[PDB]
Amino acid sequence: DDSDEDLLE
Amino acid sequence: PETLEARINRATNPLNKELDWASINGFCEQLNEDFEGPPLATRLLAHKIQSPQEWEAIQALTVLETCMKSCGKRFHDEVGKFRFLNELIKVVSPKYLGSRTSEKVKNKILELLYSWTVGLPEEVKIAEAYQMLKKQGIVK
C-alpha cells in the first residue's frame, strides 16, 4: 500500500 | 508461536542484564512470518523507542537495527514510510521529544538513519527524512 503520512517537518 | 507483543516485551525488557538474542531475533523471525507482521512490528517498535526508560528504548533500537539487517522488503518498506520515520524524527528533534531524550538514544537513531541511506538507497523516504534532519542542523 502506497499511502503514508506527510513528512513531519 | 509467541506473539510479536510477547517477543518485543522480552527483547526490550528494562530488567534485561544483557541483550536477549532469542527474543530479538525471535521478533524478527515472527514479523516475517505473518502477513500483517511488519506493520505491527513497526507500531510496537515506535512505542518502545519513545520510552523514557532508556534501556527499554536502546534495546528497541537494537531490535530495529537487527531486523532491518535480517528481514525485508516488507519490513524495509514499512520502516521506510513517514508513518514510521516520523516517530524517529519525534525522538531526535528539539521541537518534539529531543529535549527529554538522551544523547545516546538520539545518536543511535541518527546512526541507523545514516546507515539505511547508504545500505537501502531504494527507500527514498528514509533518505528524505535524513537530509531534512541534516538541513535543520540536527545532523551532522
UniProtKB/Swiss-Prot annotation, chain A:
Similarity remark: Belongs to the VPS10-related sortilin family. SORT1 subfamily.
Where is it made, tissue-wise? Expressed in brain and prostate (at protein level). Expressed at high levels in brain, spinal cord, heart, skeletal muscle, thyroid, placenta and testis. Expressed at lower levels in lymphoid organs, kidney, colon and liver.
Organism (species): Homo sapiens
Mod. after translation: The N-terminal propeptide is cleaved by furin and possibly other homologous proteases.
Q: Which part of the full protein does this chain span, and how long is the full protein?
A: 823 to 831 of 831
| Free-text comment about domains | The N-terminal propeptide may facilitate precursor transport within the Golgi stack. Intrachain binding of the N-terminal propeptide and the extracellular domain may also inhibit premature ligand binding. The extracellular domain may be shed following protease cleavage in some cell types.
Q: Where in the cell is it found?
A: Golgi apparatus, Golgi stack membrane; Endosome membrane; Endoplasmic reticulum membrane; Nucleus membrane
Question: For the motif DXXLL motif involved in the interaction with GGA1, what are the positions?
Answer: 4-8
Residues annotated with Phosphoserine modification: 3
What protein does this entry describe? Answer: Sortilin
Coiled coil (UniProt feature): none
Q: What induces it?
A: During osteoblast differentiation.
Q: Which disease is it linked to?
A: A common polymorphism located in a non-coding region between CELSR2 and PSRC1 alters a CEBP transcription factor binding site and is responsible for changes in hepatic expression of SORT1. Altered SORT1 expression in liver affects low density lipoprotein cholesterol levels in plasma and is associated with susceptibility to myocardial infarction.
State the protein's purpose: Functions as a sorting receptor in the Golgi compartment and as a clearance receptor on the cell surface. Required for protein transport from the Golgi apparatus to the lysosomes by a pathway that is independent of the mannose-6-phosphate receptor (M6PR). Lysosomal proteins bind specifically to the receptor in the Golgi apparatus and the resulting receptor-ligand complex is transported to an acidic prelysosomal compartment where the low pH mediates the dissociation of the complex.
Q: Gene symbol? A: SORT1
Assembly description: Interacts with LPL and SLC2A4. Interacts with the cytosolic adapter proteins GGA1 and GGA2. Interacts with numerous ligands including the receptor-associated protein LRPAP1/RAP, GM2A and NTS. Forms a complex with NGFR which binds specifically to the precursor forms of NGFB (proNGFB) and BDNF (proBDNF). Interacts with the Trk receptors NTRK1, NTRK2 and NTRK3; may regulate their anterograde axonal transport and signaling. Interacts with CLN5. Interacts with PSAP.
- Judging by the UniProt lineage, the source's domain of life is Eukaryota
Swiss-Prot record, chain B:
Posttranslational modification, per the record?
A: Phosphorylated by CK2 and dephosphorylated by PP2A. Phosphorylation of GGA1 allows the internal DXXLL motif to bind the VHS domain and to inhibit the recognition of cargo signals. Ubiquitinated.
| Keyword Acetylation annotated | yes
Single GO molecular function: phosphatidylinositol binding
Keyword Ubl conjugation attributed: yes
Alphabetically, which GO biological process terms does the record hold?
Golgi to plasma membrane protein transport; Golgi to plasma membrane transport; intracellular protein transport; positive regulation of protein catabolic process; protein catabolic process; protein localization; protein localization to cell surface; protein localization to ciliary membrane
Q: Which domain of life is it from?
A: Eukaryota
Q: Where is the VHS domain?
A: 11-140
GO cellular component terms, alphabetically, are: cytosol; early endosome; early endosome membrane; endosome membrane; Golgi apparatus; intracellular membrane-bounded organelle; membrane; nucleoplasm
List keywords of the entry alphabetically.
Answer: Acetylation, Endosome, Golgi apparatus, Membrane, Phosphoprotein, Protein transport, Transport, Ubl conjugation
Which tissue types show expression of this protein? Ubiquitously expressed.
Subcellular localization is given as: Golgi apparatus, trans-Golgi network membrane; Endosome membrane; Early endosome membrane
Q: Which residues form a coiled coil?
A: none
Free-text comment about domains: The VHS domain functions as a recognition module for sorting signals composed of an acidic cluster followed by two leucines (DXXLL motif).
Task: Name the family.
Answer: Belongs to the GGA protein family.
Q: What does this protein do?
A: Plays a role in protein sorting and trafficking between the trans-Golgi network (TGN) and endosomes. Mediates the ARF-dependent recruitment of clathrin to the TGN and binds ubiquitinated proteins and membrane cargo molecules with a cytosolic acidic cluster-dileucine (DXXLL) motif. Mediates export of the GPCR receptor ADRA2B to the cell surface. Required for targeting PKD1:PKD2 complex from the trans-Golgi network to the cilium membrane. Regulates retrograde transport of proteins such as phosphorylated form of BACE1 from endosomes to the trans-Golgi network.
Give the quaternary structure: Monomer. Interacts with GGA2 and GGA3. Binds to clathrin and activated ARFs, including ARF1, ARF5 and ARF6. Interacts with RABEP1. Interacts with RABGEF1. Interacts with the type-I membrane proteins LRP3, M6PR/CD-MPR and IGF2R/CI-MPR. Interacts (via N-terminal VHS domain) with SORL1/sorLA and SORT1 (via C-terminal cytosolic domain). Interacts with EPN4. Interacts with CCDC91. Interacts with HEATR5B/p200a. Interacts with SYNRG/gamma-synergin. Interacts (via GAE doamin) with NECAP1 and NECAP2. Interacts (via GAE domain) with AFTPH/aftiphilin. Interacts with TSG101 and UBC. Interacts with RNF11.
Q: What is this protein called?
A: ADP-ribosylation factor-binding protein GGA1
Q: Which organism is it from?
A: Homo sapiens (Human)
Where the shown chain sits in the full protein? 7 to 146 of 639
